[PDB]
Short mmCIF file of C-alpha atoms and ligand atoms in Angstrom, two decimals:
data_model
loop_
_atom_site.label_atom_id
_atom_site.label_comp_id
_atom_site.label_asym_id
_atom_site.label_seq_id
_atom_site.Cartn_x
_atom_site.Cartn_y
_atom_site.Cartn_z
CA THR A 8 81.81 138.48 54.59
CA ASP A 9 82.62 139.04 58.27
CA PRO A 10 84.16 135.71 59.40
CA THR A 11 84.31 136.62 63.09
CA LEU A 12 80.63 137.58 63.11
CA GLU A 13 79.51 134.53 61.14
CA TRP A 14 81.53 132.38 63.52
CA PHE A 15 80.01 134.05 66.57
CA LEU A 16 76.49 133.63 65.16
CA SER A 17 77.02 129.92 64.48
CA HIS A 18 77.34 129.41 68.27
CA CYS A 19 74.07 131.30 68.92
CA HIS A 20 70.48 130.24 68.54
CA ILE A 21 68.43 132.65 66.47
CA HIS A 22 64.75 133.46 66.74
CA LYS A 23 62.14 135.75 65.23
CA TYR A 24 60.22 138.24 67.36
CA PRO A 25 57.27 140.22 66.03
CA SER A 26 57.00 143.95 66.53
CA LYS A 27 56.00 144.99 70.07
CA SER A 28 57.26 141.81 71.72
CA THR A 29 59.41 142.05 74.86
CA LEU A 30 62.87 140.46 74.46
CA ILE A 31 64.21 141.39 77.90
CA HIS A 32 62.30 142.14 81.14
CA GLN A 33 63.96 144.45 83.69
CA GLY A 34 64.85 142.62 86.90
CA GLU A 35 65.21 139.11 85.33
CA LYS A 36 68.49 137.40 86.23
CA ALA A 37 71.01 137.93 83.39
CA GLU A 38 72.71 134.82 82.06
CA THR A 39 72.68 135.36 78.29
CA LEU A 40 73.89 137.77 75.58
CA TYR A 41 71.88 138.81 72.46
CA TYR A 42 72.76 140.22 69.07
CA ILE A 43 70.38 141.84 66.58
CA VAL A 44 70.65 140.10 63.20
CA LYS A 45 67.69 142.09 61.79
CA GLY A 46 65.33 144.72 63.06
CA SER A 47 65.33 147.41 65.72
CA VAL A 48 64.47 147.50 69.43
CA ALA A 49 63.86 150.09 72.14
CA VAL A 50 65.64 150.01 75.48
CA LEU A 51 63.13 151.34 78.10
CA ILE A 52 63.06 152.16 81.78
CA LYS A 53 59.97 152.97 83.92
CA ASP A 54 59.12 154.97 86.99
CA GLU A 55 57.26 153.55 89.98
CA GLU A 56 53.92 154.15 88.24
CA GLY A 57 54.77 152.73 84.82
CA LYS A 58 55.69 155.92 82.94
CA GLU A 59 58.30 155.00 80.26
CA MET A 60 61.47 156.53 78.98
CA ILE A 61 63.57 155.32 76.06
CA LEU A 62 67.30 155.09 76.90
CA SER A 63 68.23 154.09 73.36
CA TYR A 64 67.19 152.47 70.13
CA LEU A 65 69.40 149.57 69.02
CA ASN A 66 69.60 148.14 65.51
CA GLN A 67 71.07 145.46 63.29
CA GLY A 68 74.63 144.71 64.42
CA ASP A 69 74.01 145.79 68.05
CA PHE A 70 74.61 143.54 71.08
CA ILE A 71 71.97 143.51 73.78
CA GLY A 72 71.93 142.03 77.26
CA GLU A 73 75.68 142.53 77.69
CA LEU A 74 75.63 144.30 81.07
CA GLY A 75 75.50 141.19 83.25
CA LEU A 76 78.35 139.41 81.46
CA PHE A 77 81.22 140.41 83.75
CA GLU A 78 79.77 139.49 87.13
CA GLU A 79 77.39 136.67 88.08
CA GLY A 80 74.08 137.16 89.81
CA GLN A 81 73.10 140.43 88.19
CA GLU A 82 69.71 141.45 86.90
CA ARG A 83 68.62 143.00 83.59
CA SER A 84 68.91 146.78 83.88
CA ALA A 85 66.07 147.70 81.50
CA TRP A 86 63.32 146.36 79.31
CA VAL A 87 64.03 145.72 75.64
CA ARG A 88 60.99 145.78 73.28
CA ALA A 89 60.98 145.06 69.49
CA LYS A 90 60.12 148.24 67.55
CA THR A 91 60.00 146.30 64.26
CA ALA A 92 59.87 142.59 63.54
CA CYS A 93 63.31 141.33 64.58
CA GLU A 94 65.65 138.43 64.21
CA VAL A 95 67.77 138.11 67.35
CA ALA A 96 70.66 135.75 68.17
CA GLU A 97 71.11 134.49 71.81
CA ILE A 98 74.04 132.78 73.54
CA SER A 99 74.80 131.93 77.16
CA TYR A 100 77.44 134.01 78.88
CA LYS A 101 79.26 130.77 79.67
CA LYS A 102 79.62 129.93 75.93
CA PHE A 103 80.46 133.51 75.00
CA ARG A 104 83.33 133.49 77.50
CA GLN A 105 84.64 130.38 75.72
CA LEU A 106 84.51 132.26 72.42
CA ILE A 107 86.37 135.20 73.93
CA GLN A 108 89.30 132.96 74.78
CA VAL A 109 89.39 131.65 71.18
CA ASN A 110 89.36 135.18 69.63
CA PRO A 111 89.35 138.36 71.83
CA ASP A 112 88.21 140.40 68.85
CA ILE A 113 84.58 139.45 69.62
CA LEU A 114 85.00 141.10 73.04
CA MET A 115 86.68 144.15 71.45
CA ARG A 116 83.54 144.58 69.27
CA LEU A 117 81.17 144.32 72.23
CA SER A 118 83.30 146.76 74.28
CA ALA A 119 83.35 149.32 71.48
CA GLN A 120 79.52 149.36 71.63
CA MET A 121 79.54 149.74 75.40
CA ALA A 122 81.92 152.71 75.07
CA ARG A 123 79.65 154.43 72.54
CA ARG A 124 76.61 153.82 74.72
CA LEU A 125 78.32 155.42 77.71
CA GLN A 126 79.19 158.51 75.64
CA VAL A 127 75.62 158.83 74.31
CA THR A 128 73.97 158.16 77.67
CA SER A 129 76.26 160.65 79.48
CA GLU A 130 75.14 163.36 77.00
CA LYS A 131 71.57 162.76 78.19
CA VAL A 132 72.43 163.50 81.82
CA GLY A 133 73.46 167.05 81.09
CA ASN A 134 70.11 167.76 79.42
CA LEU A 135 67.80 166.23 81.97
CA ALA A 136 69.50 167.95 84.88
CA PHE A 137 69.34 171.42 83.36
CA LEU A 138 65.98 171.46 81.55
CA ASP A 139 62.46 171.13 82.87
CA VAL A 140 59.76 169.22 80.98
CA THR A 141 58.97 172.15 78.63
CA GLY A 142 62.61 172.65 77.79
CA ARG A 143 63.08 168.91 77.27
CA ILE A 144 60.21 168.74 74.79
CA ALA A 145 61.32 171.89 72.99
CA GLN A 146 64.89 170.57 72.70
CA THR A 147 63.57 167.20 71.49
CA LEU A 148 61.52 168.79 68.69
CA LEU A 149 64.60 170.78 67.49
CA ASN A 150 66.73 167.64 67.65
CA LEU A 151 64.18 165.67 65.60
CA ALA A 152 63.95 168.45 63.01
CA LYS A 153 67.72 168.19 62.47
CA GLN A 154 67.73 164.43 61.77
CA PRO A 155 68.25 163.18 58.22
CA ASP A 156 64.65 161.91 58.03
CA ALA A 157 63.15 165.31 58.89
CA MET A 158 61.20 166.70 55.89
CA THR A 159 61.49 170.17 54.44
CA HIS A 160 58.52 172.47 54.96
CA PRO A 161 58.12 175.95 53.45
CA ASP A 162 58.10 177.27 57.04
CA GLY A 163 61.02 175.20 58.36
CA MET A 164 61.13 171.47 58.99
CA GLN A 165 58.38 168.89 59.40
CA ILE A 166 58.54 165.77 61.58
CA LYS A 167 56.22 162.82 62.10
CA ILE A 168 56.09 161.59 65.72
CA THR A 169 53.31 160.75 68.19
CA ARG A 170 52.64 162.44 71.52
CA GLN A 171 53.29 158.98 73.05
CA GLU A 172 56.68 158.76 71.32
CA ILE A 173 57.72 162.25 72.44
CA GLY A 174 56.59 161.30 75.95
CA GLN A 175 58.86 158.24 75.77
CA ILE A 176 61.79 160.41 74.72
CA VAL A 177 61.47 162.88 77.62
CA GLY A 178 60.01 160.56 80.27
CA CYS A 179 56.54 162.19 80.55
CA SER A 180 52.91 161.28 79.83
CA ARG A 181 51.33 161.65 76.40
CA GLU A 182 48.91 164.06 78.10
CA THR A 183 51.68 166.34 79.40
CA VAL A 184 53.14 166.31 75.87
CA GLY A 185 49.76 167.44 74.52
CA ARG A 186 49.55 170.35 76.96
CA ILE A 187 53.09 171.51 76.18
CA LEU A 188 52.72 171.20 72.37
CA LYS A 189 49.66 173.45 72.60
CA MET A 190 51.66 175.98 74.63
CA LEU A 191 54.58 175.99 72.13
CA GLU A 192 52.06 176.45 69.31
CA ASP A 193 50.56 179.40 71.18
CA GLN A 194 54.13 180.76 71.53
CA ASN A 195 54.38 180.64 67.72
CA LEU A 196 57.25 178.11 67.80
CA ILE A 197 55.58 175.11 66.16
CA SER A 198 52.48 174.02 64.37
CA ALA A 199 50.94 170.76 65.51
CA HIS A 200 47.24 171.27 64.73
CA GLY A 201 48.25 169.80 61.39
CA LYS A 202 48.95 166.09 60.99
CA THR A 203 52.73 166.28 61.46
CA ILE A 204 54.63 168.74 63.60
CA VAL A 205 56.16 171.74 61.87
CA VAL A 206 59.16 173.27 63.64
CA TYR A 207 59.51 176.92 62.59
CA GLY A 208 62.92 177.87 61.30
CA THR A 209 65.78 175.86 59.79
CA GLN B 7 93.92 144.83 96.40
CA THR B 8 96.18 143.56 93.58
CA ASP B 9 97.12 140.49 91.55
CA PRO B 10 99.89 139.58 89.12
CA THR B 11 97.75 140.44 86.11
CA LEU B 12 97.22 143.99 87.35
CA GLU B 13 100.91 144.24 88.31
CA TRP B 14 101.90 142.95 84.84
CA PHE B 15 99.74 145.65 83.31
CA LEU B 16 101.07 148.32 85.65
CA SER B 17 104.72 147.45 84.81
CA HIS B 18 103.98 148.70 81.28
CA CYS B 19 102.75 152.06 82.62
CA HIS B 20 104.31 155.32 83.69
CA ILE B 21 102.97 156.42 87.06
CA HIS B 22 102.40 160.15 87.70
CA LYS B 23 101.28 162.21 90.68
CA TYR B 24 98.48 164.81 90.63
CA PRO B 25 97.69 167.14 93.50
CA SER B 26 94.14 167.72 94.57
CA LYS B 27 92.12 169.85 92.14
CA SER B 28 94.48 169.30 89.24
CA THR B 29 92.87 168.29 85.92
CA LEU B 30 94.04 164.96 84.43
CA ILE B 31 91.86 165.00 81.30
CA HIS B 32 90.25 167.94 79.45
CA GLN B 33 87.12 167.56 77.41
CA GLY B 34 87.92 167.81 73.69
CA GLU B 35 91.54 166.64 73.85
CA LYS B 36 92.56 163.99 71.36
CA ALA B 37 92.12 160.63 73.13
CA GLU B 38 95.27 158.51 72.78
CA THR B 39 96.07 157.34 76.38
CA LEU B 40 94.41 155.07 78.97
CA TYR B 41 94.70 155.80 82.72
CA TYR B 42 94.39 153.69 85.87
CA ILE B 43 93.97 155.10 89.39
CA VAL B 44 96.65 153.60 91.65
CA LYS B 45 95.76 155.89 94.54
CA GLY B 46 93.20 158.59 95.24
CA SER B 47 89.89 159.70 93.67
CA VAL B 48 88.64 161.93 90.85
CA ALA B 49 85.52 163.63 89.61
CA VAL B 50 84.23 163.30 86.04
CA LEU B 51 82.61 166.58 84.93
CA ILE B 52 80.62 167.84 81.95
CA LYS B 53 79.10 171.29 81.33
CA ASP B 54 75.80 172.89 80.31
CA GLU B 55 75.55 175.32 77.39
CA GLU B 56 76.04 178.11 79.92
CA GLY B 57 79.32 176.54 81.08
CA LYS B 58 77.99 175.38 84.46
CA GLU B 59 79.66 172.18 85.70
CA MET B 60 77.92 168.92 86.48
CA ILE B 61 79.45 165.97 88.25
CA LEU B 62 78.81 162.89 86.17
CA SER B 63 80.62 160.32 88.38
CA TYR B 64 83.29 159.89 91.03
CA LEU B 65 86.01 157.29 90.32
CA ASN B 66 88.38 155.76 92.84
CA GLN B 67 91.44 153.56 93.36
CA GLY B 68 91.32 150.60 90.94
CA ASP B 69 89.26 152.43 88.30
CA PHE B 70 90.39 152.87 84.70
CA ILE B 71 89.89 156.36 83.23
CA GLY B 72 90.18 157.64 79.69
CA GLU B 73 88.93 154.39 78.15
CA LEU B 74 86.17 155.71 75.91
CA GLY B 75 88.37 156.56 72.95
CA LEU B 76 90.21 153.19 72.93
CA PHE B 77 88.05 151.34 70.36
CA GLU B 78 88.09 153.84 67.49
CA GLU B 79 90.88 156.22 66.50
CA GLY B 80 90.33 159.92 66.25
CA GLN B 81 87.96 160.54 69.11
CA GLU B 82 87.92 163.37 71.68
CA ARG B 83 87.73 163.06 75.46
CA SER B 84 84.03 163.07 76.44
CA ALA B 85 84.47 164.79 79.79
CA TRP B 86 86.85 166.54 82.11
CA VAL B 87 88.51 164.47 84.85
CA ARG B 88 89.77 166.29 87.94
CA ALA B 89 91.62 165.00 91.03
CA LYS B 90 89.39 165.18 94.18
CA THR B 91 92.23 164.18 96.47
CA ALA B 92 95.91 163.83 95.77
CA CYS B 93 96.20 161.10 93.08
CA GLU B 94 98.68 158.61 91.69
CA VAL B 95 97.65 157.56 88.19
CA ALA B 96 99.21 155.05 85.78
CA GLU B 97 99.12 155.84 82.07
CA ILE B 98 99.68 153.83 78.84
CA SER B 99 99.16 154.60 75.15
CA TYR B 100 96.16 153.04 73.49
CA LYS B 101 98.56 151.45 70.99
CA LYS B 102 100.52 149.65 73.73
CA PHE B 103 97.40 148.66 75.58
CA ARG B 104 95.89 147.11 72.44
CA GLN B 105 99.09 145.05 72.21
CA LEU B 106 98.63 143.86 75.83
CA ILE B 107 95.06 142.75 75.05
CA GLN B 108 96.36 140.37 72.38
CA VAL B 109 98.86 138.96 74.89
CA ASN B 110 96.29 138.47 77.66
CA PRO B 111 92.62 139.44 77.00
CA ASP B 112 91.86 139.23 80.69
CA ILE B 113 93.05 142.86 80.99
CA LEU B 114 90.31 143.86 78.49
CA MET B 115 87.77 141.82 80.55
CA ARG B 116 88.70 143.90 83.61
CA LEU B 117 88.28 147.18 81.72
CA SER B 118 84.99 146.04 80.14
CA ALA B 119 83.55 145.04 83.54
CA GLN B 120 84.01 148.65 84.66
CA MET B 121 82.44 150.01 81.45
CA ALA B 122 79.39 147.79 81.99
CA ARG B 123 79.02 148.97 85.61
CA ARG B 124 79.36 152.60 84.44
CA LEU B 125 76.60 152.17 81.85
CA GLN B 126 74.29 150.68 84.56
CA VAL B 127 75.08 153.52 86.98
CA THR B 128 74.73 156.29 84.35
CA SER B 129 71.49 154.84 83.01
CA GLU B 130 70.09 154.74 86.57
CA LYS B 131 71.07 158.44 86.89
CA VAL B 132 69.22 159.21 83.62
CA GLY B 133 66.05 157.59 85.03
CA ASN B 134 66.47 159.53 88.33
CA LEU B 135 66.90 162.90 86.54
CA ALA B 136 63.99 162.20 84.21
CA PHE B 137 61.54 160.76 86.71
CA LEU B 138 62.19 162.05 90.23
CA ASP B 139 61.30 165.48 91.48
CA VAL B 140 64.18 167.73 92.67
CA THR B 141 63.64 166.56 96.25
CA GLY B 142 63.79 162.92 95.33
CA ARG B 143 66.85 163.60 93.15
CA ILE B 144 68.73 164.92 96.17
CA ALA B 145 67.57 162.23 98.50
CA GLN B 146 68.81 159.52 96.11
CA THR B 147 72.11 161.41 95.61
CA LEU B 148 72.77 161.26 99.35
CA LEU B 149 72.08 157.52 99.35
CA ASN B 150 74.53 157.13 96.46
CA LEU B 151 77.24 159.25 98.14
CA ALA B 152 76.94 157.05 101.20
CA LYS B 153 78.17 154.13 98.99
CA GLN B 154 81.46 155.85 98.04
CA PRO B 155 84.72 154.48 99.53
CA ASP B 156 85.32 157.58 101.65
CA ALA B 157 81.95 157.47 103.41
CA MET B 158 82.34 156.53 107.09
CA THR B 159 80.24 154.13 109.16
CA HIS B 160 77.84 155.64 111.68
CA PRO B 161 75.47 154.34 114.38
CA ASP B 162 72.43 155.46 112.36
CA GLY B 163 73.73 154.94 108.82
CA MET B 164 76.66 156.45 106.96
CA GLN B 165 78.44 159.76 107.41
CA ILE B 166 79.52 161.82 104.38
CA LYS B 167 81.31 165.14 103.82
CA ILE B 168 79.85 167.14 100.94
CA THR B 169 79.10 170.78 100.06
CA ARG B 170 75.85 172.35 98.87
CA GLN B 171 77.73 173.16 95.67
CA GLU B 172 78.81 169.52 95.06
CA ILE B 173 75.32 168.21 95.67
CA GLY B 174 74.02 170.90 93.35
CA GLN B 175 76.48 169.88 90.64
CA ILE B 176 75.37 166.28 90.94
CA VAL B 177 71.61 167.04 90.66
CA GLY B 178 71.79 170.24 88.64
CA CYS B 179 70.45 172.66 91.24
CA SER B 180 71.57 175.88 92.88
CA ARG B 181 73.28 175.79 96.25
CA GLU B 182 70.24 177.75 97.49
CA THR B 183 67.73 175.12 96.42
CA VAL B 184 69.94 172.36 97.88
CA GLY B 185 69.99 174.09 101.24
CA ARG B 186 66.22 174.42 101.27
CA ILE B 187 65.73 170.75 100.40
CA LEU B 188 68.32 169.51 102.88
CA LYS B 189 66.45 171.30 105.65
CA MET B 190 63.29 169.44 104.62
CA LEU B 191 64.95 166.04 104.52
CA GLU B 192 66.30 166.75 108.00
CA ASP B 193 62.84 167.64 109.29
CA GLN B 194 61.53 164.48 107.64
CA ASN B 195 64.15 162.74 109.74
CA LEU B 196 65.93 161.21 106.72
CA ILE B 197 69.29 162.81 107.47
CA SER B 198 71.18 164.89 110.03
CA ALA B 199 73.48 167.75 108.96
CA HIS B 200 76.39 169.38 110.86
CA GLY B 201 78.32 171.97 108.90
CA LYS B 202 79.53 170.13 105.76
CA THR B 203 78.96 166.75 107.41
CA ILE B 204 75.79 164.70 106.79
CA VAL B 205 74.64 161.51 108.43
CA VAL B 206 72.51 159.56 105.96
CA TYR B 207 70.05 157.27 107.65
CA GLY B 208 70.17 153.68 106.47
N1 CMP C 301 71.93 153.31 78.35
C1 CMP C 301 71.88 152.26 77.52
N2 CMP C 301 72.17 152.43 76.23
C2 CMP C 301 72.01 151.37 75.32
N3 CMP C 301 71.53 150.16 75.83
C3 CMP C 301 71.33 150.04 77.15
C4 CMP C 301 71.48 151.07 77.99
N4 CMP C 301 71.09 150.63 79.19
C5 CMP C 301 70.72 149.36 79.09
N5 CMP C 301 70.89 148.98 77.83
C6 CMP C 301 70.68 147.62 77.25
O1 CMP C 301 69.51 147.02 77.83
C7 CMP C 301 69.90 145.72 78.30
C8 CMP C 301 69.08 145.28 79.49
O2 CMP C 301 69.62 144.02 79.92
P1 CMP C 301 71.16 144.07 80.40
O3 CMP C 301 71.23 144.96 81.58
O4 CMP C 301 71.63 142.68 80.56
O5 CMP C 301 71.94 144.74 79.16
C9 CMP C 301 71.31 145.98 78.79
C10 CMP C 301 71.85 146.67 77.55
O6 CMP C 301 71.97 145.77 76.44
N1 CMP C 302 79.26 158.36 82.62
C1 CMP C 302 80.52 158.20 83.04
N2 CMP C 302 80.73 157.48 84.15
C2 CMP C 302 82.04 157.25 84.60
N3 CMP C 302 83.09 157.81 83.87
C3 CMP C 302 82.80 158.52 82.77
C4 CMP C 302 81.54 158.73 82.37
N4 CMP C 302 81.61 159.47 81.26
C5 CMP C 302 82.89 159.70 80.98
N5 CMP C 302 83.63 159.12 81.93
C6 CMP C 302 85.11 159.04 82.02
O1 CMP C 302 85.67 160.33 81.68
C7 CMP C 302 86.70 160.08 80.70
C8 CMP C 302 86.88 161.24 79.73
O2 CMP C 302 87.86 160.83 78.76
P1 CMP C 302 87.37 159.60 77.83
O3 CMP C 302 86.15 160.02 77.10
O4 CMP C 302 88.51 159.12 77.03
O5 CMP C 302 86.98 158.47 78.92
C9 CMP C 302 86.05 158.98 79.89
C10 CMP C 302 85.69 158.03 81.03
O6 CMP C 302 86.86 157.46 81.63
#
């Protein structure tokens, strides 16, 4: 029973998107705000040749498309792709600005998300500047093995993730991931010849 | 410049002076206060595990600082903020600012516009660190420095004043590596250097 949210949503139009669909294309002019009613999405950027990196996952209760709201004529800063089937609310910036005047609390909620995103994204900068691709992948595997969904393994922790997915986390090709996983395995730090990846130590 | 809404806000603030190099905000402090730069500029810094500093952003006259803890009590400052020139900085408790928002939400709109711009800029830096080689990282850094308020017009582009150390802290390289790359960009006729002065070609 969140009256402000239900009220906000009643001014949106809501649509279903299947997994893998693209909600937002980078470079499109930004005139509308989104809100995830159900599902999860990936926010992605690309280099000149199409190599992808994930800036963030966003989930139920997250706003999307907010970055052009405060100045007209801006473009979308990233792609947003559905990672699961999603239900996503959309509203024009013009209408949302009307809602803000009615109850500023809806803006407070959006701004709280933007603040968190800046904190999380700033933490990434430190890592990318200081580590090379091997160090980025190594750090990523340790980070994944410390998440709640990591599984225990007699030898440490076990994670399930594709070379493609790791590549999207660090901004490199699935091939480069493959080469580096083999090197870490030869350094006795992980086992990947299995199905999942085992990260040695807890 | 200024308007009555900013002056209204400022009349609720205490204004304090900070000499160059003095630290306004230390990482880890309890966040309870919002700042606004009335005059001067600052650097926002974070550190690597080894304690080496990185420059995350510059901020200038008209920028809010210390905003990231406003939306949820109990948070810590996410970075250090240090005066780059002599500074005059307005300050107000989060509690009093949240009262002002309820009186006139436009002051929150102004803060949120800067948070959105910061997320765009920091996300672009994440892509640059992830994707570009060290040479390209530095070349893009010089282009970005040329957009700062203190950069000066020049026949062939913009003129900036910056040290090997500062560039290194922005891209995460040694002063040695920066020097070597600057010499290359100069040979590639992308810039011209003179002591600590650099002309960045358009
Ligand atoms: N670093 C980030 N963290 C979380 N989401 C982001 C980040 N960068 C971009 N986005 C989201 O991706 C959206 C792309 O379109 P917009 O720029 O309009 O709004 C953007 C944000 O909703
Ligand atoms: N990525 C960033 N870009 C611009 N300013 C930042 C960035 N990260 C942190 N800051 C600023 O540094 C301040 C540190 O204190 P706060 O976390 O309260 O608020 C932070 C922001 O004002």
